[PDB]
Structures are given as C-alpha cells and as structure tokens.
Design an enzyme around this catalytic site. Structure first.
Site, PDB file in Angstrom:
ATOM      1  N   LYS A   5       0.796  -1.156   0.000  1.00  0.00           N
ATOM      2  CA  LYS A   5       0.000   0.000   0.000  1.00  0.00           C
ATOM      3  C   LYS A   5       0.855   1.242   0.000  1.00  0.00           C
ATOM      4  O   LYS A   5       1.756   1.361   0.806  1.00  0.00           O
ATOM      5  CB  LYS A   5      -0.837  -0.002   1.212  1.00  0.00           C
ATOM      6  N   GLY A  59      -8.335   7.909   0.559  1.00  0.00           N
ATOM      7  CA  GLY A  59      -7.620   8.885   1.353  1.00  0.00           C
ATOM      8  C   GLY A  59      -6.292   8.418   1.935  1.00  0.00           C
ATOM      9  O   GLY A  59      -5.905   8.891   3.009  1.00  0.00           O
ATOM     10  N   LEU A  60      -5.643   7.433   1.319  1.00  0.00           N
ATOM     11  CA  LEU A  60      -4.355   6.926   1.687  1.00  0.00           C
ATOM     12  C   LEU A  60      -4.334   6.413   3.105  1.00  0.00           C
ATOM     13  O   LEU A  60      -3.365   6.628   3.905  1.00  0.00           O
ATOM     14  CB  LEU A  60      -3.281   8.025   1.450  1.00  0.00           C
ATOM     15  N   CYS A 114       0.206  11.348  -5.861  1.00  0.00           N
ATOM     16  CA  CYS A 114       0.139  12.007  -4.579  1.00  0.00           C
ATOM     17  C   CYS A 114      -0.604  13.417  -4.880  1.00  0.00           C
ATOM     18  O   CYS A 114      -0.394  14.057  -5.882  1.00  0.00           O
ATOM     19  CB  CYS A 114       1.533  12.105  -3.956  1.00  0.00           C
TER      20      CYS A 114
HETATM   21  C1  LIG Z   1      -9.339   0.518  -2.963  1.00  0.00           C
HETATM   22  C2  LIG Z   1      -8.247   1.075  -3.781  1.00  0.00           C
HETATM   23  C3  LIG Z   1      -7.097   1.568  -3.210  1.00  0.00           C
HETATM   24  C4  LIG Z   1      -6.101   2.082  -4.072  1.00  0.00           C
HETATM   25  N1  LIG Z   1      -4.947   2.621  -3.497  1.00  0.00           N
HETATM   26  C5  LIG Z   1      -3.887   2.936  -4.275  1.00  0.00           C
HETATM   27  C6  LIG Z   1      -2.619   3.263  -3.718  1.00  0.00           C
HETATM   28  O1  LIG Z   1      -2.508   3.279  -2.443  1.00  0.00           O
HETATM   29  N2  LIG Z   1      -1.597   3.602  -4.561  1.00  0.00           N
HETATM   30  C7  LIG Z   1      -1.735   3.565  -5.901  1.00  0.00           C
HETATM   31  O2  LIG Z   1      -0.758   3.724  -6.641  1.00  0.00           O
HETATM   32  N3  LIG Z   1      -2.909   3.220  -6.529  1.00  0.00           N
HETATM   33  C8  LIG Z   1      -3.959   2.878  -5.748  1.00  0.00           C
HETATM   34  N4  LIG Z   1      -5.142   2.503  -6.304  1.00  0.00           N
HETATM   35  C9  LIG Z   1      -5.221   2.396  -7.764  1.00  0.00           C
HETATM   36  C10 LIG Z   1      -4.963   0.984  -8.244  1.00  0.00           C
HETATM   37  O3  LIG Z   1      -3.619   0.684  -7.953  1.00  0.00           O
HETATM   38  C11 LIG Z   1      -5.138   0.878  -9.716  1.00  0.00           C
HETATM   39  O4  LIG Z   1      -4.215   1.756 -10.357  1.00  0.00           O
HETATM   40  C12 LIG Z   1      -6.574   1.242 -10.185  1.00  0.00           C
HETATM   41  O5  LIG Z   1      -7.546   0.656  -9.277  1.00  0.00           O
HETATM   42  C13 LIG Z   1      -6.836   0.674 -11.606  1.00  0.00           C
HETATM   43  O6  LIG Z   1      -6.702  -0.729 -11.736  1.00  0.00           O
HETATM   44  P1  LIG Z   1      -8.015  -1.702 -11.751  1.00  0.00           P
HETATM   45  O7  LIG Z   1      -8.797  -1.294 -12.936  1.00  0.00           O
HETATM   46  O8  LIG Z   1      -7.490  -3.113 -11.790  1.00  0.00           O
HETATM   47  O9  LIG Z   1      -8.755  -1.403 -10.452  1.00  0.00           O
HETATM   48  C14 LIG Z   1      -6.200   2.011  -5.496  1.00  0.00           C
HETATM   49  C15 LIG Z   1      -7.315   1.445  -6.061  1.00  0.00           C
HETATM   50  C16 LIG Z   1      -8.323   0.966  -5.231  1.00  0.00           C
HETATM   51  C17 LIG Z   1      -9.510   0.380  -5.851  1.00  0.00           C
HETATM   52  O1  LIG Z   2      -5.749   6.095  -1.207  1.00  0.00           O
HETATM   53  C1  LIG Z   2      -6.380   6.466  -2.194  1.00  0.00           C
HETATM   54  O2  LIG Z   2      -7.475   7.041  -2.145  1.00  0.00           O
HETATM   55  C2  LIG Z   2      -5.833   6.221  -3.570  1.00  0.00           C
HETATM   56  N1  LIG Z   2      -6.820   5.726  -4.465  1.00  0.00           N
HETATM   57  C3  LIG Z   2      -6.517   5.446  -5.769  1.00  0.00           C
HETATM   58  O3  LIG Z   2      -7.401   5.062  -6.533  1.00  0.00           O
HETATM   59  N2  LIG Z   2      -5.230   5.724  -6.161  1.00  0.00           N
HETATM   60  C4  LIG Z   2      -4.244   6.343  -5.367  1.00  0.00           C
HETATM   61  O4  LIG Z   2      -3.092   6.527  -5.802  1.00  0.00           O
HETATM   62  C5  LIG Z   2      -4.583   6.529  -3.991  1.00  0.00           C
HETATM   63  C6  LIG Z   2      -3.636   7.121  -3.146  1.00  0.00           C
HETATM   64  C7  LIG Z   2      -3.426   8.678  -3.522  1.00  0.00           C
HETATM   65  C8  LIG Z   2      -4.470   9.457  -2.930  1.00  0.00           C
HETATM   66  C9  LIG Z   2      -5.731   9.533  -3.548  1.00  0.00           C
HETATM   67  C10 LIG Z   2      -6.797  10.247  -2.979  1.00  0.00           C
HETATM   68  C11 LIG Z   2      -6.641  10.934  -1.785  1.00  0.00           C
HETATM   69  C12 LIG Z   2      -7.735  11.678  -1.246  1.00  0.00           C
HETATM   70  C13 LIG Z   2      -7.563  12.333  -0.030  1.00  0.00           C
HETATM   71  C14 LIG Z   2      -6.305  12.284   0.570  1.00  0.00           C
HETATM   72  C15 LIG Z   2      -5.225  11.615   0.015  1.00  0.00           C
HETATM   73  C16 LIG Z   2      -5.384  10.904  -1.178  1.00  0.00           C
HETATM   74  C17 LIG Z   2      -4.275  10.172  -1.744  1.00  0.00           C
END
Ligand SMILES: Cc1cc2nc3c(=O)[nH]c(=O)nc-3n(C[C@H](O)[C@H](O)[C@H](O)COP(=O)(O)O)c2cc1C
Ligand SMILES: O=C(O)c1[nH]c(=O)[nH]c(=O)c1CCc1ccc2ccccc2c1
Ligand SMILES: Cc1cc2nc3c(=O)[nH]c(=O)nc-3n(C[C@H](O)[C@H](O)[C@H](O)COP(=O)(O)O)c2cc1C
Ligand SMILES: O=C(O)c1[nH]c(=O)[nH]c(=O)c1CCc1ccc2ccccc2c1
Lengths: 313, 313
Positions: free
Chosen positions: B44, B71-72, B131
């Site tokens: 993550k 929201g990370l 970010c």
């Molecule tokens: C619940 C959730 C959490 C995610 N958190 C991150 C993250 O922490 N960092 C990041 O690079 N992408 C994050 N993403 C984006 C995924 O890595 C991915 O790029 C995006 O969901 C598209 O791929 P998919 O179509 O297989 O879902 C998140 C996606 C989901 C659904």
């Molecule tokens: O943690 C996530 O929400 C998230 N979701 C994605 O689909 N991709 C991402 O890269 C991330 C992490 C980056 C991110 C994305 C959304 C956020 C919203 C409020 C605060 C911080 C946030 C940080």
C-alpha cells in the site's frame, strides 16, 4: 403526464437529443433526427470547408461502448447554415448547430454568419472546444488560456447566448479553473458535459490488432465506459455554474441513465453511442423508461429532481 | 510455454501482481499476497506517518468496476520498511514498496531510508505520482513542473533504479510531455500505467444518492470502465519510453485482458478492482487463462508478443 420543458427561450417536448456527430452529418440524417421523437437535434460539428475526415475504419462499437477518430468529416459550414436557414422545420423541434473550427479565426468567421440566422430562426450554437490548438499544445479546452481567448473572440463576434461542448476533466482543480473561465462569459448559457474520453485504445485479442485505422488505433471513447465520468462532469459544472444550464452527454442507454444525468444536474440529455447503435427509435424507449422511473418515484416534473443527487453526511 | 519474466534484476514466475492499494495494507494482507500464485506484490502507498484515511463508505464496486476515495489509509512508512527489511520472504517472489508522500520532502525522507534496504534485500520502489500536492493544484503528475521536481529530488535522494505510478492521460500532447519528463530520469526504469481514472461519480438510481462519502461522492474509477484508457496509456508510454519497462494496470479481469495489456507493451500486469472483488484466487485463473490464449496462438513466451499490437495499414 409528459416530459415537456422550456430552456433558452425554446420549448422542448422532452430532454433528449442526439449527441453531436451522431446521426447528423447529412441532410438525410438531420431529417431523420427531426422525424424522431427526440426533443431537439444538433448538427455535426463543422468547419468552414467540407472535410472527408480520416481513413476508415474510424468508428467501432462494442458491448461496453465505442471508439472513434472520425477526423471531423462534415459537409462544411455553408451546408449546415443553409440547413438551419432554409430546410429545418422549427415547428417540429429546436435545432442546435455545432461549430468546431481549426482556429479561433475560423470560429469567428462562422459565428458572424450564424448570428443573423440565430436571430431570425432561433437556431442555437454549440461551440465544440475539443478542437485544434497551436504547436505543443493540447486541445483547446485543456489549455485554459486558449479557451479564454476562444470564448472572448466568439462572444464578441456572435453576441448572442450560446453553449460550449466540453471534454471531460479528471481533477478537481481543473474543474475549478475551467468553470471559472466559463463563468467569465455571460453569453455562455449552457455547458454540454461531456465529449468522448480522449485517446483510449481498443485492441482485438483474436487479431492482435487495434480496431480503428487513424492514430494507431487511439480514439475517443463513448458509451458505458464513460457514464461515471460524464456524471461527474455534469455535476461538477452544475455546482460551479449556477447561472448556466448543463447538458449531459455520455453513457446514456436507458431512461435510468438519463435519470442519473438529470439528478446530477442535466437539463437536456444527449445520446451518442447508444443512438449510433440502436438508431432513432431509441428516443421513444428512453422517454418511456424515464417516465416510468418518474412514476414509480412519484415525480411529476424534471425540475423536482434535477440536480438533487444526494451526498452522504 | 511459460509466463516467466526476468526484469529489473529479479525473476518473476508470472507477470501478475496486485495493484497498489488492494490487498496490501496490513501484514496479514502482505502475507496473503505472498502466499498467492501472483508473480509479485506491491505494498500500500504509504506516508511517513500512519493514516486512517477518509470516512466510510469510501470504496464501492459494481459490475463494470469500482470507485474509491480511500484517502491513503496506511500503517506508515516504518511498517512497510520493516516488512521489506525483516518480514518478507524474497524466496517466494519479489516485493515492490509503493510510496506516496504528501510533499516532495516527505518522499525524499522516505526514499533516503529505503535505499539501504533496497540495496540489501532488493525491494523495488514504486513512486506514486498521483500524490495530491497542494490543494487547488492538480495532482502531481498533472503538474509537469511538480512532477519534474519530484523526480529530480527522489533520483538524488535514492540513487537506485525505481519506477513510477502514473495517472491516465487523455491528450496526445500530455502523453508527449509526460514521457519526455520521465525520459529525463535514467533511474526511472519502469512506468506503471495507470492509476484510477480520477473524479468519476457513481450515482445509485434507487436511492438517488452518490455511493461514497468523501468528496461529495467523487472518486477514482477502476475496473471494466477503464480498460481502453489503461491500454492507451500502456501503449503510449511503451512507444515513447524505449529504454524503460511499462507495467500495465487497469481493467484486468481475465487472461484475455492481460494479453491485451501485454500486446500493448506491459511487462508486469497489476490487478486492482478484480482482485478486490474476487480475492487472490484470481491469480491462478488469470495464469491459466493467459496460458490458454498463448497455446491457441502458439506463443511460448511473453516476449513473443509483448508490444506487438498491430496497427491498421
Ligand atoms: C481501494 C483502492 C485503493 C487504491 N490505493 C492505491 C494506492 O494506495 N496507490 C496507488 O498507486 N494506486 C492505488 N489505487 C489504484 C490501483 O492501484 C489501480 O491503479 C486502479 O484501481 C486501476 O486498476 P483496476 O482497474 O485493476 O482497479 C487504489 C485502487 C483501489 C480500488
Ligand atoms: O488512497 C487512495 O485514495 C488512492 N486511491 C486510488 O485510486 N489511487 C491512489 O493513488 C490513492 C492514493 C493517492 C491518494 C488519492 C486520494 C486521496 C484523497 C484524499 C487524501 C489523500 C489521497 C491520496
Ligand atoms: C462517431 C462520433 C462522432 C462524433 N463527433 C462529434 C462532433 O462532431 N462533435 C462533438 O461535439 N462531439 C462528437 N462526438 C462526441 C459525442 O457527441 C459524445 O460527446 C460522445 O460520444 C459521448 O457520448 P456517448 O457516451 O453517448 O457516446 C462524436 C462521437 C461519435 C461516437
Ligand atoms: O470527428 C471527430 O473525430 C470527433 N469525435 C469525437 O468523439 N468528438 C469530437 O469532438 C470530434 C471532432 C473534433 C474535431 C474538431 C475539429 C477538428 C479539426 C481537424 C481535424 C479533426 C478535428 C476533430
């Protein structure tokens, strides 16, 4: 129980219309759209001169939507102006004419000529901002200083209320900047959200090939792929532009989809891909479906629920 | 016939891995991904300090994909560094650590401390350029000057090969500009295309409500909605970054989807939404499915078709 509404000093039988580019290029197409049960029609975005557009295949559709790189094939502005001026039957429904010049000068030239026809006949202008920009630069609506220039020059040249067709945005700061540009222009009375989602790529697994010829297979996406994108843009601009109407476009295949557009803030609802796929009979189905959902909910008017999407806490 | 890859001085049994954010937040999650048949895992995206993330509900899934504004939420950098340095079994598969500092200085502080662990244990860094940065500015990778700053500072502070996670782009001028920025940084050895499609809006017709609580229901889209957009980005960067690997992410639910990614240029193939929905058993299915398509076509290895998408005439 009926879906009639009034906007922009015109009356509409219902909120549905084609999306620009679909079923609206030739006189035959425009007459077919006029004969349909749609509430309005919009002509194919035009340039000053006629264009053949890109090589075929340049459109393909699939269960989840469509991809295109048409390349603005059109009959040229003189044709669409003549259609607006002499051929369209305004007693049947309103007409929107879409313009997409390759430069600001070309847009000014076309809108100066459209103005008297807008005054005399009431044709409405939709200015397509997904149009060519200067070297190095993205499409106009993604270059906010070019967008400001286009709208300044068109506003001055045209002098009458008009609308703008927007590409989707994906970033809240972009929504904020774009809506602030638009709100500089009082003559911009409607915003249509959205054009196709730019430069997607559909690959056929069996053939191992892209499915459209132009641009190495890259093209704008429409249909089911884009509905949440389209809803977000509709609502973002509905919230940011309270003195303007928003027209929703993207991913409408059913009355339920239209319902969601209207809940997000849509006044008119445009139909692109699903219209291309199903043909103009779709308009009766969409009307019936929308009225059925209204009835089940107890809504008697569109205005009871337009823009009234609920948020959580 | 085999799915093996060797890249970045590691060996991978197959190209599949989780997408960052999915099934990778806790030690339990990481142990689960390690026990799965995936070829790798990524942790993550983390911040220096632990975060609770946004209020729930903040993730929802539907037949065509997912929306999230998580929201990370994460256990903080020190936890993920410890997992990398002391807990992960590198004999099972390789580990990527994703970081997503809220400022360039937070990213530099983390990479400085990752470096020696990267050098000693071989954990691979994925820097998330989605970010947020300053509110009212676009996300980092949509602000090319910020992006360049981040990459300069991280390259100096880390001093080892790393990769970057990119949002999707929709305009050729952005593909051109973004790739050009990445190509300034020789330590950027892989580019993961794509993160979620930003600020979509899902609305539930029965309840007339958005489905996630943060940001008035706006959040990033994944799943079937985004596959052509993901493909486009993988191929755009594959073509523009000939000295870097591209990893594909978006819309993978099947071996066929993975095949399309790989034809577009993907080396690793990450699985977000479908993994969240199906669980880690998906990896055996995807592998079997991809091997079945390879057998039908007579492909013995991935490199036989990677990047080999055909264009028309
Ligand atoms: C619940 C959730 C959490 C995610 N958190 C991150 C993250 O922490 N960092 C990041 O690079 N992408 C994050 N993403 C984006 C995924 O890595 C991915 O790029 C995006 O969901 C598209 O791929 P998919 O179509 O297989 O879902 C998140 C996606 C989901 C659904
Ligand atoms: O943690 C996530 O929400 C998230 N979701 C994605 O689909 N991709 C991402 O890269 C991330 C992490 C980056 C991110 C994305 C959304 C956020 C919203 C409020 C605060 C911080 C946030 C940080
Ligand atoms: C074949 C085709 C041609 C199009 N041409 C135009 C055009 O000339 N002007 C325009 O504003 N949008 C044009 N579009 C975009 C559509 O008006 C619409 O914004 C997009 O298809 C998304 O709506 P949908 O999901 O209903 O397809 C075109 C779309 C398609 C599929
Ligand atoms: O005709 C198109 O390819 C098209 N497709 C869409 O999905 N949306 C559109 O807005 C357009 C036309 C946009 C447009 C507008 C002006 C153009 C000028 C020269 C070459 C191509 C041009 C394309």
């Amino acid at each position: 129980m009926c879906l009639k509404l009034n906007l922009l000093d015109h009356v509409f039988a219902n909120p549905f219309m084609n999306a620009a580019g679909v079923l609206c290029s030739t006189e035959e197409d425009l007459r077919c759209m006029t004969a349909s049960s749609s509430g309005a029609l919009v002509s194919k975005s035009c340039t000053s001169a006629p264009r053949d557009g890109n090589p075929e295949p340049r459109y393909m559709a699939f269960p989840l939507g469509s991809i295109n790189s048409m390349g603005l094939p059109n009959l040229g502005f003189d044709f669409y102006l003549k259609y607006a001026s002499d051929l369209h039957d305004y007693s049947k429904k309103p007409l929107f004419l879409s313009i997409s010049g390759l430069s600001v000068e070309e847009n000014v030239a076309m809108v100066r000529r459209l103005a008297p026809v807008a005054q005399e006949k009431g044709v409405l202008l939709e200015l397509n901002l997904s149009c060519p920009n200067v070297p190095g630069k993205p499409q106009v609506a993604y270059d906010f200083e070019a967008m400001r220039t286009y709208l300044q020059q068109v506003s001055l040249a045209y002098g009458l209320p008009f609308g703008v067709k927007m590409p989707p945005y994906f970033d809240i700061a972009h929504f904020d900047t774009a809506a602030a540009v638009l709100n500089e222009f009082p003559l911009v009375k409607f915003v249509t959200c959205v054009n196709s989602v730019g430069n997607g790529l559909v690959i056929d697994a069996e053939s191992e090939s892209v499915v459209i010829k132009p641009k190495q297979g890259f093209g704008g996406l429409g249909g089911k792929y884009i509905l949440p994108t389209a809803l977000a843009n509709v609502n973002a601009f509905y919230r940011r532009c309270p003195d303007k109407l928003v027209f929703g476009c993207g991913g409408v295949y059913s009355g339920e989809d239209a319902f969601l557009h209207i809940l997000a803030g849509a006044s008119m609802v445009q139909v692109g891909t699903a219209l291309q796929e199903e043909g103009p009979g779709i308009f009766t189905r969409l009307e019936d479906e929308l009225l059925e959902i209204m009835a089940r909910k107890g809504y008697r008017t569109l205005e009871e629920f337009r823009g009234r999407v609920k948020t959580i806490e």
